[PDB]
Amino acid sequence: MNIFEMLRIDEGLRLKIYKDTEGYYTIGIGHLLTKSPSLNAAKSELDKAIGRNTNGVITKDEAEKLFNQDVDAAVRGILRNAKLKPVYDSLDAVRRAVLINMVFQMGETGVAGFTNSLRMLQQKRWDEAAVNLAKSRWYNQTPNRAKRVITTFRTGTWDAYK
C-alpha cells in the first residue's frame, strides 16, 4: 500500500466532471476544480488545468497526471507549513501517508487547524489523538473515510485499507 493507492481508494476515479460530497465541481481523482456553482466556470478551470478544450471529459492518463501533481503539491504544502512540517517529520512512514491524505482532502490550512490533535500526534499519543480527531466536522461529514484515516493513525498499519 502507498499514498497513491490509498487516496485512489478514498477518492475514486471519475472521468467526467462531478460534484464532490460538499457539492463542488471536481474531476478525476478528487481534483477540485472550483467552489463556484457554475458549470461553465468548472469547464473553464478544467480546460486550463489540462491544456486543451475538454468538453468536461478527460482521459485516464490526464486524470493520473492531475493526481500526481496534486500529491506532489500536498507534500510540498506540508513541508512548507510551520505547523505541519514538525509533525510530519516526527512520524513513521505509514502515518506520514495519513497526514498527506488529510491535506489532500482539506488543504493545508484545514489540517493545520487541528491544533490539539497535531500536538497529540507529535507526542505519539495515538489513542488520544484519534478521539480528538473524531470530534470534528470532518469526521461527522465523511465518517467512513475519517474512520479509515483515524484507525491508521491509531495502529500505524494499513489494515483499514486492506
PDB file of C-alpha atoms in Angstrom:
ATOM      1  CA  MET A   1       0.000   0.000   0.000  1.00  0.00           C
ATOM      2  CA  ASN A   2       1.198   3.594  -0.608  1.00  0.00           C
ATOM      3  CA  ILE A   3      -0.128   7.134  -0.790  1.00  0.00           C
ATOM      4  CA  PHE A   4      -1.423   6.844  -4.366  1.00  0.00           C
ATOM      5  CA  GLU A   5      -3.228   3.618  -3.801  1.00  0.00           C
ATOM      6  CA  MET A   6      -4.673   4.875  -0.512  1.00  0.00           C
ATOM      7  CA  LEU A   7      -6.042   8.094  -1.979  1.00  0.00           C
ATOM      8  CA  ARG A   8      -7.275   6.259  -5.062  1.00  0.00           C
ATOM      9  CA  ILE A   9      -9.387   4.163  -2.714  1.00  0.00           C
ATOM     10  CA  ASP A  10     -10.736   7.160  -0.784  1.00  0.00           C
ATOM     11  CA  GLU A  11     -11.367   9.407  -3.725  1.00  0.00           C
ATOM     12  CA  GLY A  12     -12.296   7.059  -6.518  1.00  0.00           C
ATOM     13  CA  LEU A  13     -11.723   7.879 -10.280  1.00  0.00           C
ATOM     14  CA  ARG A  14     -14.266   9.775 -12.460  1.00  0.00           C
ATOM     15  CA  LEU A  15     -13.527  10.888 -15.960  1.00  0.00           C
ATOM     16  CA  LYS A  16     -16.445  13.309 -16.259  1.00  0.00           C
ATOM     17  CA  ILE A  17     -16.973  16.412 -14.179  1.00  0.00           C
ATOM     18  CA  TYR A  18     -18.898  15.618 -10.950  1.00  0.00           C
ATOM     19  CA  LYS A  19     -19.877  17.060  -7.660  1.00  0.00           C
ATOM     20  CA  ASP A  20     -17.994  16.108  -4.520  1.00  0.00           C
ATOM     21  CA  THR A  21     -19.528  15.470  -1.083  1.00  0.00           C
ATOM     22  CA  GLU A  22     -19.825  19.236  -0.492  1.00  0.00           C
ATOM     23  CA  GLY A  23     -21.391  19.757  -3.919  1.00  0.00           C
ATOM     24  CA  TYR A  24     -18.288  21.245  -5.664  1.00  0.00           C
ATOM     25  CA  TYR A  25     -17.242  20.540  -9.179  1.00  0.00           C
ATOM     26  CA  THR A  26     -14.490  18.022  -9.288  1.00  0.00           C
ATOM     27  CA  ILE A  27     -12.892  15.559 -11.755  1.00  0.00           C
ATOM     28  CA  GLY A  28     -10.524  12.591 -11.888  1.00  0.00           C
ATOM     29  CA  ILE A  29      -9.080  11.502  -8.539  1.00  0.00           C
ATOM     30  CA  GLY A  30     -10.568  14.064  -6.208  1.00  0.00           C
ATOM     31  CA  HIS A  31      -9.216  17.076  -8.177  1.00  0.00           C
ATOM     32  CA  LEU A  32     -11.362  20.041  -7.121  1.00  0.00           C
ATOM     33  CA  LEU A  33     -11.999  22.382  -9.995  1.00  0.00           C
ATOM     34  CA  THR A  34     -13.893  25.209  -8.365  1.00  0.00           C
ATOM     35  CA  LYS A  35     -16.230  26.049  -5.485  1.00  0.00           C
ATOM     36  CA  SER A  36     -18.330  28.106  -7.935  1.00  0.00           C
ATOM     37  CA  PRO A  37     -21.819  26.892  -8.652  1.00  0.00           C
ATOM     38  CA  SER A  38     -21.156  27.475 -12.303  1.00  0.00           C
ATOM     39  CA  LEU A  39     -20.611  24.517 -14.538  1.00  0.00           C
ATOM     40  CA  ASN A  40     -19.143  26.790 -17.076  1.00  0.00           C
ATOM     41  CA  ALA A  41     -16.663  28.083 -14.621  1.00  0.00           C
ATOM     42  CA  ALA A  42     -15.770  24.436 -13.864  1.00  0.00           C
ATOM     43  CA  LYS A  43     -15.314  23.629 -17.593  1.00  0.00           C
ATOM     44  CA  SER A  44     -13.088  26.620 -17.924  1.00  0.00           C
ATOM     45  CA  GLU A  45     -10.932  25.645 -14.969  1.00  0.00           C
ATOM     46  CA  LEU A  46     -10.730  22.119 -16.362  1.00  0.00           C
ATOM     47  CA  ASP A  47      -9.532  23.306 -19.833  1.00  0.00           C
ATOM     48  CA  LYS A  48      -6.897  25.448 -18.186  1.00  0.00           C
ATOM     49  CA  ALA A  49      -5.710  22.560 -15.960  1.00  0.00           C
ATOM     50  CA  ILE A  50      -5.440  20.162 -18.858  1.00  0.00           C
ATOM     51  CA  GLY A  51      -4.325  22.450 -21.571  1.00  0.00           C
ATOM     52  CA  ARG A  52      -6.979  21.691 -24.145  1.00  0.00           C
ATOM     53  CA  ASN A  53     -10.653  22.084 -24.889  1.00  0.00           C
ATOM     54  CA  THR A  54     -12.055  19.128 -22.991  1.00  0.00           C
ATOM     55  CA  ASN A  55     -15.723  19.284 -23.128  1.00  0.00           C
ATOM     56  CA  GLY A  56     -15.824  18.253 -19.427  1.00  0.00           C
ATOM     57  CA  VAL A  57     -14.369  14.867 -20.181  1.00  0.00           C
ATOM     58  CA  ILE A  58     -10.766  13.667 -19.712  1.00  0.00           C
ATOM     59  CA  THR A  59      -8.756  10.612 -20.184  1.00  0.00           C
ATOM     60  CA  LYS A  60      -7.305   8.234 -17.620  1.00  0.00           C
ATOM     61  CA  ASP A  61      -3.846   9.457 -18.447  1.00  0.00           C
ATOM     62  CA  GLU A  62      -4.908  13.041 -17.901  1.00  0.00           C
ATOM     63  CA  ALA A  63      -6.628  12.162 -14.556  1.00  0.00           C
ATOM     64  CA  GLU A  64      -3.451  10.426 -13.424  1.00  0.00           C
ATOM     65  CA  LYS A  65      -1.359  13.390 -14.344  1.00  0.00           C
ATOM     66  CA  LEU A  66      -3.520  15.758 -12.299  1.00  0.00           C
ATOM     67  CA  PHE A  67      -3.275  13.227  -9.439  1.00  0.00           C
ATOM     68  CA  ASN A  68       0.496  13.188  -9.463  1.00  0.00           C
ATOM     69  CA  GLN A  69       0.615  16.919  -9.418  1.00  0.00           C
ATOM     70  CA  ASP A  70      -1.927  17.058  -6.576  1.00  0.00           C
ATOM     71  CA  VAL A  71       0.008  14.584  -4.375  1.00  0.00           C
ATOM     72  CA  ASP A  72       3.211  16.492  -5.046  1.00  0.00           C
ATOM     73  CA  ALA A  73       1.620  19.724  -4.109  1.00  0.00           C
ATOM     74  CA  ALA A  74       0.171  18.244  -0.897  1.00  0.00           C
ATOM     75  CA  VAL A  75       3.594  17.061   0.230  1.00  0.00           C
ATOM     76  CA  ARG A  76       5.148  20.315  -0.735  1.00  0.00           C
ATOM     77  CA  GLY A  77       2.443  22.212   1.282  1.00  0.00           C
ATOM     78  CA  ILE A  78       3.154  20.140   4.365  1.00  0.00           C
ATOM     79  CA  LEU A  79       6.848  20.773   4.129  1.00  0.00           C
ATOM     80  CA  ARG A  80       6.419  24.377   3.748  1.00  0.00           C
ATOM     81  CA  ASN A  81       3.959  24.688   6.603  1.00  0.00           C
ATOM     82  CA  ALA A  82       5.382  25.677  10.013  1.00  0.00           C
ATOM     83  CA  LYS A  83       2.744  23.819  11.983  1.00  0.00           C
ATOM     84  CA  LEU A  84       2.728  20.752   9.747  1.00  0.00           C
ATOM     85  CA  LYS A  85       6.310  20.062   8.977  1.00  0.00           C
ATOM     86  CA  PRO A  86       7.377  19.130  12.526  1.00  0.00           C
ATOM     87  CA  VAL A  87       4.530  16.748  12.848  1.00  0.00           C
ATOM     88  CA  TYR A  88       5.307  15.112   9.591  1.00  0.00           C
ATOM     89  CA  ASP A  89       8.983  14.887  10.388  1.00  0.00           C
ATOM     90  CA  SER A  90       8.205  13.155  13.694  1.00  0.00           C
ATOM     91  CA  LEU A  91       6.107  10.411  12.087  1.00  0.00           C
ATOM     92  CA  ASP A  92       6.806   6.932  10.725  1.00  0.00           C
ATOM     93  CA  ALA A  93       6.191   6.198   7.039  1.00  0.00           C
ATOM     94  CA  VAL A  94       2.645   4.900   7.378  1.00  0.00           C
ATOM     95  CA  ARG A  95       1.464   7.755   9.474  1.00  0.00           C
ATOM     96  CA  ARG A  96       3.131  10.293   7.183  1.00  0.00           C
ATOM     97  CA  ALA A  97       0.966   8.997   4.359  1.00  0.00           C
ATOM     98  CA  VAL A  98      -2.109   9.541   6.521  1.00  0.00           C
ATOM     99  CA  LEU A  99      -1.259  13.114   7.066  1.00  0.00           C
ATOM    100  CA  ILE A 100      -0.811  13.653   3.351  1.00  0.00           C
ATOM    101  CA  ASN A 101      -4.299  12.130   2.828  1.00  0.00           C
ATOM    102  CA  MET A 102      -5.813  14.636   5.164  1.00  0.00           C
ATOM    103  CA  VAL A 103      -4.046  17.569   3.467  1.00  0.00           C
ATOM    104  CA  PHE A 104      -5.099  16.372   0.050  1.00  0.00           C
ATOM    105  CA  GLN A 105      -8.687  16.388   1.301  1.00  0.00           C
ATOM    106  CA  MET A 106      -8.931  19.565   3.420  1.00  0.00           C
ATOM    107  CA  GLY A 107      -5.989  21.529   2.411  1.00  0.00           C
ATOM    108  CA  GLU A 108      -3.067  22.750   4.435  1.00  0.00           C
ATOM    109  CA  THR A 109      -4.929  25.414   6.258  1.00  0.00           C
ATOM    110  CA  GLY A 110      -7.675  22.988   7.271  1.00  0.00           C
ATOM    111  CA  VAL A 111      -5.295  20.496   8.699  1.00  0.00           C
ATOM    112  CA  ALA A 112      -3.097  22.993  10.375  1.00  0.00           C
ATOM    113  CA  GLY A 113      -6.300  23.982  12.186  1.00  0.00           C
ATOM    114  CA  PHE A 114      -6.301  20.712  14.149  1.00  0.00           C
ATOM    115  CA  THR A 115      -4.005  22.079  16.777  1.00  0.00           C
ATOM    116  CA  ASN A 116      -4.620  19.695  19.676  1.00  0.00           C
ATOM    117  CA  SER A 117      -4.612  16.614  17.527  1.00  0.00           C
ATOM    118  CA  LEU A 118      -1.345  17.642  15.850  1.00  0.00           C
ATOM    119  CA  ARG A 119       0.242  18.042  19.227  1.00  0.00           C
ATOM    120  CA  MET A 120      -1.014  14.610  20.290  1.00  0.00           C
ATOM    121  CA  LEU A 121       0.300  13.014  17.112  1.00  0.00           C
ATOM    122  CA  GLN A 122       3.643  14.651  17.691  1.00  0.00           C
ATOM    123  CA  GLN A 123       3.713  13.192  21.190  1.00  0.00           C
ATOM    124  CA  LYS A 124       2.782   9.753  19.823  1.00  0.00           C
ATOM    125  CA  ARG A 125      -0.413   9.631  21.901  1.00  0.00           C
ATOM    126  CA  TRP A 126      -2.322   7.519  19.345  1.00  0.00           C
ATOM    127  CA  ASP A 127      -5.492   6.818  21.156  1.00  0.00           C
ATOM    128  CA  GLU A 128      -5.867  10.299  22.468  1.00  0.00           C
ATOM    129  CA  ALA A 129      -5.366  11.823  19.071  1.00  0.00           C
ATOM    130  CA  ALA A 130      -7.889   9.536  17.485  1.00  0.00           C
ATOM    131  CA  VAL A 131     -10.602  10.618  19.887  1.00  0.00           C
ATOM    132  CA  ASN A 132      -9.782  14.217  19.406  1.00  0.00           C
ATOM    133  CA  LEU A 133      -9.754  13.908  15.560  1.00  0.00           C
ATOM    134  CA  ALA A 134     -13.235  12.357  15.723  1.00  0.00           C
ATOM    135  CA  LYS A 135     -14.622  15.493  17.345  1.00  0.00           C
ATOM    136  CA  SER A 136     -14.789  17.397  14.122  1.00  0.00           C
ATOM    137  CA  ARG A 137     -16.998  18.361  11.359  1.00  0.00           C
ATOM    138  CA  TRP A 138     -14.744  16.323   9.042  1.00  0.00           C
ATOM    139  CA  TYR A 139     -15.482  13.103  10.864  1.00  0.00           C
ATOM    140  CA  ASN A 140     -19.186  13.866  11.040  1.00  0.00           C
ATOM    141  CA  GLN A 141     -19.475  14.694   7.259  1.00  0.00           C
ATOM    142  CA  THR A 142     -17.432  11.779   5.909  1.00  0.00           C
ATOM    143  CA  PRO A 143     -17.319   9.277   8.729  1.00  0.00           C
ATOM    144  CA  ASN A 144     -16.299   6.163   6.673  1.00  0.00           C
ATOM    145  CA  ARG A 145     -13.256   7.869   5.241  1.00  0.00           C
ATOM    146  CA  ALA A 146     -12.404   9.592   8.539  1.00  0.00           C
ATOM    147  CA  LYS A 147     -12.653   6.280  10.369  1.00  0.00           C
ATOM    148  CA  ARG A 148     -10.136   4.718   7.952  1.00  0.00           C
ATOM    149  CA  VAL A 149      -7.702   7.569   8.381  1.00  0.00           C
ATOM    150  CA  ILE A 150      -8.081   7.711  12.167  1.00  0.00           C
ATOM    151  CA  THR A 151      -7.599   3.979  12.612  1.00  0.00           C
ATOM    152  CA  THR A 152      -4.452   4.085  10.529  1.00  0.00           C
ATOM    153  CA  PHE A 153      -3.127   6.872  12.887  1.00  0.00           C
ATOM    154  CA  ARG A 154      -4.023   4.652  15.867  1.00  0.00           C
ATOM    155  CA  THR A 155      -2.446   1.467  14.546  1.00  0.00           C
ATOM    156  CA  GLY A 156       0.345   2.536  12.265  1.00  0.00           C
ATOM    157  CA  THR A 157      -0.562  -0.248   9.848  1.00  0.00           C
ATOM    158  CA  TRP A 158      -2.628  -0.410   6.557  1.00  0.00           C
ATOM    159  CA  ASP A 159      -5.262  -2.811   7.893  1.00  0.00           C
ATOM    160  CA  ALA A 160      -8.091  -0.404   7.407  1.00  0.00           C
ATOM    161  CA  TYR A 161      -7.288  -0.209   3.716  1.00  0.00           C
ATOM    162  CA  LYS A 162      -6.824  -3.912   3.165  1.00  0.00           C
TER     163      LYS A 162
END
